[PDB]
Amino acid sequence: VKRLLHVAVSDSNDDVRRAAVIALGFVLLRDYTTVPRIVQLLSKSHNAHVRCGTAFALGIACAGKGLQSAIDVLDPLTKDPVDFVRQAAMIALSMILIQQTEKLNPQVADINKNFLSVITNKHQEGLAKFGACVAQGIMNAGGRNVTIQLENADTGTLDTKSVVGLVMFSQFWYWFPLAHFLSLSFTPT
Amino acid sequence: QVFDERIKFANQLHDEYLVSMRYPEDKKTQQNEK
Amino acid sequence: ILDKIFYGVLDQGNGWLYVYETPNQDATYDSALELVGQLNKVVDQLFEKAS
Amino acid sequence: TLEPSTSITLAERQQLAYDLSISALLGDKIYNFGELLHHPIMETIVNDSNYDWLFQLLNALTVGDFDKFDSLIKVQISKIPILAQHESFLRQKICLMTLIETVFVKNIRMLSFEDISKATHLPKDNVEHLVMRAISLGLLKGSIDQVNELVTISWVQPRIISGDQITKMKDRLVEWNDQVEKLGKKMEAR
Amino acid sequence: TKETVYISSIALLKMLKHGRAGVPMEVMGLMLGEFVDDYTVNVVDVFAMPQSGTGVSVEAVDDVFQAKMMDMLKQTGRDQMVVGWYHSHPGFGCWLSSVDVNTQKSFEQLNSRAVAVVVDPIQSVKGKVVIDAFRLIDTGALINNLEPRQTTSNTGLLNKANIQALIHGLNRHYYSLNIDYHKTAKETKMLMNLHKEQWQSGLKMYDYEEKEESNLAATKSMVKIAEQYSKRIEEEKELTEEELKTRYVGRQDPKKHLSETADETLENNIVSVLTAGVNSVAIK
Amino acid sequence: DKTENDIKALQSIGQLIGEVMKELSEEKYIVKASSGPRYIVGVRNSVDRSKLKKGVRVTLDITTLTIMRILPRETDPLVYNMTSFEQGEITFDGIGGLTEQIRELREVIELPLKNPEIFQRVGIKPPKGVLLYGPPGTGKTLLAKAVAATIGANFIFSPASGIVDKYIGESARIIREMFAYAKEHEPCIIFMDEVDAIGGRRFSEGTSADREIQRTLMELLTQMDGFDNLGQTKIIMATNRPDTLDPALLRPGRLDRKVEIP
Amino acid sequence: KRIQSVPLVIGQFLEPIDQNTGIVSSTTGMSYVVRILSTLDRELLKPSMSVALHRHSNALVDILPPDSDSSISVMGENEKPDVTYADVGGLDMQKQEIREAVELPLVQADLYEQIGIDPPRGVLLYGPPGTGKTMLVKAVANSTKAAFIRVNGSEFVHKYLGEGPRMVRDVFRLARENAPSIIFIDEVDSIATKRFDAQTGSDREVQRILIELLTQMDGFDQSTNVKVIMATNRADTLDPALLRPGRLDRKIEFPSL
Amino acid sequence: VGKAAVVKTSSRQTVFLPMVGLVDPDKLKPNDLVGVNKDSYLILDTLPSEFDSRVKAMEVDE
Amino acid sequence: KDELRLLQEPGSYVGEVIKIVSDKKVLVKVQPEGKYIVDVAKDINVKDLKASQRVCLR
Amino acid sequence: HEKVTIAPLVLLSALDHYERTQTKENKRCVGVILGDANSSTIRVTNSFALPFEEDEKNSDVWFLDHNYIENMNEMCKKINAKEKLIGWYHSGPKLRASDLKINELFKKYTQNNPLLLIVDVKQQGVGLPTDAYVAIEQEKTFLHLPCTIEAEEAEEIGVEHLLRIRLTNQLKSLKGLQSKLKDVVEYLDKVIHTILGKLQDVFNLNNLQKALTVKTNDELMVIYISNLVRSIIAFDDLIENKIQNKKIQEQRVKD
């Protein structure tokens, strides 16, 4: 934790600061309760990539687990005019909000409207509506059945296929979308 | 020798003070406000 | 010398004389004038915001 | 000091040193007779036929005997008191070179009147008058203590000499390096 | 697909210095490097070129002076293949070059990867080093190689893109400007020893030793008066508002002289340590 | 070789020109560009703060807006509307017969221009204005260029007919620029012609249907009796009769000499 | 550094909007939204003042003083006169009248507050200039350490209508910010003259110069931020209202015996 | 000052630039055609007399 | 963050609205220039603009 | 003496010449610089390279072509007319016969004294990899000149984008005192007089210090006046949060 903390501070590279805060979520997979408190402290900065990395790193451990309050941490990240911050926030919302509908979380109503709202709106970012369409299919993936399970009781240990597919997601528009590797983390219930 | 002690006397009032600001303040952010 | 015209001190016993420079000090304690005026007002106003 | 230039025969080197022998008599400027010892001048000439005036006054500074050099010269250059006046300076100038690092390793510059009185063959009452004539003529700069009878000088022209001189100057740099292990290690950790 | 140009720290500074002098004055230069199509792009060395009467054009390139530099730049490795040219222009809302318009088409016949770089600010640089390049399109952007897969595309959000007058279309048919800079190990340590904040280097031990000690005559001389300046700054504030409200119109007045006099005490504490740090060799 | 030097000279870059409107600080001067609106510029190098001050022509930068070269103060065509010639022209043989009067005039004029320390040891001040009046064209031109010839000071011809016109504040900027030219070059003497039109006391010494007369009467009084006078420059006026002028300018302290030209 | 640096321009402030935001007017005439300095908020920020701006970035720089020096309506100003005070004998009658009307209101005026009256805003002078007027008043400014500004009756005289009183507005406006200031008026009868005839063209300005001079004196209340000394040369039937102890206090006439 | 020339174009813009060897002090005179830059307004070289602003309605009879 | 946003602003003047257009434009009079048709901002209503209405134009 | 001001672009590009060709210790690159040598402060606005060949085993073997400089100068005439040849630079600390002789070839196209620059390709130790030296005779004597780094406005701003107190000086001061001790020991082995005579005079600058101790504590007491300000600053640090601490109890009633 102390190593990844100094990498995102001393170094001035935004891509490295983004990769450092995402790498912290893989160490915190055991404890999902303290993840929102750590990423919220790093969510306040002058760099967009720092807020972009803490957005997806929050949804890694909080996807198949509880603690619905992590959505409120991702709420100010959606209003960010930056394009790639909104996209990583939409994907992070789709991971935590799986099976959270029907009088469980109040934020399931606001996320369902943003499916067609960001795409049809010309005021939003180009990459924001591209991830909103992807986030719409994550909650309904496998016919609203499969979910992202990483470090749970069913596997018993760290899933190799699930941890690698999330690393490949950190690179999207820099080369060509790598999101095809995410299919390894979807298991039905 | 005595002059150097007066510097620490004024600095002794820091750690007992700056830390005591946020001390009560944790109830403001947790509780809901109008 | 009693009127602070000439600066010096004499010796009545041996009939001698000594050297006396005009400045005996510089500005040091003057900073306490702004210090005593602040702690007699600012401190009193802090009690008003408490009650 | 120039090797490649001034190419002359051996006989002309003695006549060239003859002008150098009479040049250092009546004045002390530009070091002393010891400067020509390092240069290939004094070692390239002969020690007789009045060519030893550079050698005689070189060791006469520590000995302090004027009659040794007076017997080897003529009446022309021995009738001028300036020769004996400026010769006493180089006797003290050797002691003046000891005011940087020689004995005391504490970097304390102290020179009394008794050390320069026996070396320069001059009485005590003329010590005060000797310092006044040195500063007035531009030979040296500084001040002297008339209370405790001490001398603290100013910038001078130290010679090219070595050995005990460089030995004491390198030991001072060790004290600079010893303080690196004393004051430096404390500030580096803090 | 569109190329991603990686300009070294040495070549980026030369192109800014050559096109520096004057707003109206236009110049021209040549860029060297070795890279392959699609990735691997780079810029090694750049140097200015002789200007003809037409200013920026294809005929202004002199191969006589260029061939002589090839044998000169080969000894130090500066000799490479020409990757394009860089130019300087006063600048406008669109088409920064008032002379060069279709001459880039003549550049594409010699090299397909050659581009023309134009400096927008002309000594207006705010520190971001924003430069503009150009690439010939002509017939394209319909069922062809897909450019906007690389970095920072879909420019023209609202009315602000780059110059802000170009927005979407940019110069010609959305050339999709892509520029990146990189530094090496030798370039990293050299710039930090030359220009970072202010250059005190060339003597490392004499930096704070000469400035905080031997400079006291021009800095801290008459320190008793210098201490009175610290009082006048506090008297300018503390004497005004003692009520912690709005009367004399002040708020941070106690913190105005707090940070200003903090360095004065700090600098006096630094020279205090350096005072004993002179090492006069006293001991006993 | 000279052709190549002309090729290298065409690559040079010129600069702008302006005058300081206001002095904000020592390193900052508020100026006015001749090629554009008002700007506030800095300093670059070789800036002499003694010779450069508020109201001095500067060299503006087109890009960074800085001051490079210091230029003398010029607004109106001081080399056209005002005649400036080196020393004098007319010799002493034409002014002959006035030697008795000229000998007394050179002592209060030529002496303070050459050796100002003559009257400093005495404790007095040299006179400024000297009135030479007579028939038109007789003695006005001769005595003008003869005084500047024997002293060595430059000949300044600034007739009073270039003052009163129809313009907004013409007479205000004529005296200032005339005072600025005499301030730059000390060895100079100002001469005028036909000063009867710019004078007169009216009644209460105000303005009635004459705009440029009163501004001339007061400004000429404030220059000599002000804080900064011309010690190296003498003011000379020419008219037909002294009774046709304003007695305000004929009082001691400005015009100390009335000399008739017969 | 990027707010000011080397480049600077001139602009006129109009109205603000938000913190670090305001609408100004540049020299070219086109308005721009600049960034108000964090120091200037409400009281420190002047509602209408000529300020400094940035060439391109267009950011607020500093508040420029309302300089009255220009090529039109030129009013001379003296800096550190060299005349020694009390250099002419027989002034003992005036020497007591000068201190109370000059030195007291600019220094000791707090004594008038103990009395309960406002300090005198000026003094009237009579008699031709040159006797205890020119050299005397210029020597008093050195004793009071005040700015001596020359505004005469034959000054600010030019053919543009309205700048004469407009320049008067700018001088006394700056004189209110700086207390140590002295404005001397020589030959006020040129100003005190009224219109006995309709002049059509040419000079219409006889009655305009009294509007702003009386507005800064008879218009406002009694307070002295500046010393206005009106010296009357020759006047008989002229009653501009500058006379009487309405604002100025003492009436000093040069002794004829 | 001495080695620099002061030129004023038809654009109401005065440019202060040092003199160049290509132009001569006798060739630079008022009411003359001196070719300069349109943008930088820099003196290049003088032009021969063609349009002198002849002030028409002027009777010329030899 | 507010430094880069405010310092890079080119500036904006004040003008009066003349008439509104059904094409989502508006005619605003400019004092140094004159009447010039501009485009209504996305956050500003075109129908709320009345005659002689004070607005800000970039 | 004179002064030398080198732009950071010249020193940055000179080191790059070593890495590109992977030059060994047997070859040393030589190049030229441009600027104005007329004034007392030498300013270097430009730099180039030359195809210089040299043998390491033989100091009498060197190759330098001046025709490449002629064709290069004609190209600069169409670019910048104010750029003239002010000197040249070479790589490596060692000064051999090949480096000292070629200095005269550049004197033909240089009116003033050509500037001598010794470039360190290994950048080992302290700062300033390239020292500025001047050639003067009484045997050529190379004297050190003050080296300052100053560039134009646009050049200094562009460098900040590439990279985007008391203890610092003490770390470099400890290694400086130890390096001076080795310079005396290494010089002793070379002899078995000129430098030793100068160092003894420089080192010349508690007998008179018995009464000079009082002024040391007098300056420290004036520093303590600033420490009293630090106490006032500490007193003001105690006032700051009390403004916030009293507002804490005010929010208890509102909430």
GROMACS .gro file of C-alpha atoms in nm, chain E residues 144 146-147 191:
model
    4
  608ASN     CA    1  -1.044   0.375  -4.524
  610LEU     CA    2  -0.930   0.432  -3.918
  611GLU     CA    3  -0.730   0.719  -3.771
  655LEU     CA    4   1.761   1.985  -1.787
   0.00000   0.00000   0.00000
